[PDB]
Amino acid sequence: MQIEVTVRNITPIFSAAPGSNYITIDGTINPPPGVSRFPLVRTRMMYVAADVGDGVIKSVPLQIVPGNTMRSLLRRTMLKHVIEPALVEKGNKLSIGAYATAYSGNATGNPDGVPSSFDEIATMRAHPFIGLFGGGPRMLEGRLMVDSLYPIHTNAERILGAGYENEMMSGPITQVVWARRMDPILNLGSSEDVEVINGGAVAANGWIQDLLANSKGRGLKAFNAHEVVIPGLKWVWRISLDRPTDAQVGLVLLALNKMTNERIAGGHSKDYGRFVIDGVSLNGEQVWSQSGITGGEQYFDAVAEAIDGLSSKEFEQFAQSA
Amino acid sequence: MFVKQVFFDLGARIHADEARALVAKLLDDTQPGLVSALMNYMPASKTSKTEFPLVQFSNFNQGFALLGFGEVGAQILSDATPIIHDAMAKLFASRGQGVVVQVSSRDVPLSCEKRPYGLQYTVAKMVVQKKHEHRERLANPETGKVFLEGLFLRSLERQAAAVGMVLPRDLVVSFKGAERVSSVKLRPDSTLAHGSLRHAVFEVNARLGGLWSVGFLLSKGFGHINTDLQLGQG
RNA sequence: GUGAACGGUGGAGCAACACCUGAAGGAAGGCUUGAUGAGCGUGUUCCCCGCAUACGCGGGG
Structure with a gap:
């Protein structure tokens, strides 16, 4: 079951790579030491084979949002307003281990060395939530197969190829945005602002005096950067499912109906990662309109009678460890 | 090498000379070594060194600056900034x-190079006078330009020698114009001046770095x- | 004229068949690049330090 979600970013997208890189004033990512480099946390990035010339492909760098991030996103939005409202609406409450297995996939770090019975796997598998997301102490397999969000870009022409004849981004698609820190005590220069302090002017002068010793216990007032994809470009997402029930597909579609208010990226204090869905292809047919998904009726009905009757006994026997 | 510039914001502008006097007044009773070092005093007596003062007061619009x-x-x-x-x-x-x-605190590096084209640099509140022979030199223009020439070149040379970097010795200067002539007093209510x-302009073929006194x-x-x-200038 | 002299360890024989390294996990929170040095006061003989060796040069406030 192939779901091709084409979206368009409203604000820019910043999904940070764990590698700590550095940047000078005008470009020069990762300079040599001794240039007074600033810290930089780049947007995360897969390489991709691309035709940069006449039929020769290179591993050009592509900045994306990873599949684990938006798998956690899709799990969190479906468990935030499709499953847990249905859990608390009829009064059932998850256990603390059941909550840990619902959100993270495991209760503790240590799993069971034993295997579970097949009747358990038959209950939890082919289910609206535990079928899609496995885990627990027995490491149950999850039906749902969440890919990363590539941009529609010429470097990703080899990915989802022989499509989008026009509307293909070819230029540079990123920007480095600088964020500086202020020390608020330093930027006062008034009595009305320091009348609020316990201690007042002498306390502010003492903290500034400590900052004088620490200028030449990490202080404030830094000036850093982050490398961020530009906004307003098309992105594609793929969701896959092997032998899915109609309730599982309906739960994915209900999460994706109201996906538009959630955060695909990090750095959400700068509102980074707002996206508007251009369309949703359900095995190639366009099912997205302005008022959510039109089409896929049986999936919505099956998840409608599936989330009713969704107790927490199954979550509790999921999270129970031998 | 580099010169450290520290700005203090007192909310109201006080001048550099009264800042030096105010700082010498408040730290007179306690901690004599730091005020002796910031005043460039003798290790034994209160008399200042005849060499280049390594640290000096300067101007600031909301307070005073230290170099x-x-x-x-x-x-x-x-070391001296937090107690101040x-x-x-x-x-x-x-x-x-x-x-x-x-x-505020900056570390401005020093640099100099030579190009075969003279360059404009203006200096405000420039003191040229210490002895009666310099009155005799400034009375006639022809013997006055050469005195300003030697003073500017030797001032560049002494600060370059004090901070520890080499000046090219093929430098030529020139003094074009003056705006005003004014006195400076040593202590308040003193007859000596x-x-x-005021607003001297000079022309030096070299390139001039910041904190150049x-x-x-x-x-x-x-x-x-x-x-x-x-x-x-922008 | 060595209880010596003279005497091939040889031939052939397939370590092989069948097993998916996996499973399930959000780099993410919080954080003014535009101010800091650029424009506004002093009116005449005085401390101290070196080179000299006083005929004077240089300079610290």
């Missing part, structure tokens, strides 16, 4: 409601300006 030339001057400023800030804190919190003393030049009475806050801002 420490070289590693020794930068170290002196870095605590002193202005207690002084401005003793009377009135109380203000907060804000700080020193002649001084010329003339006499450098520790009192005269004859220094940043040449980096004057180079490509």
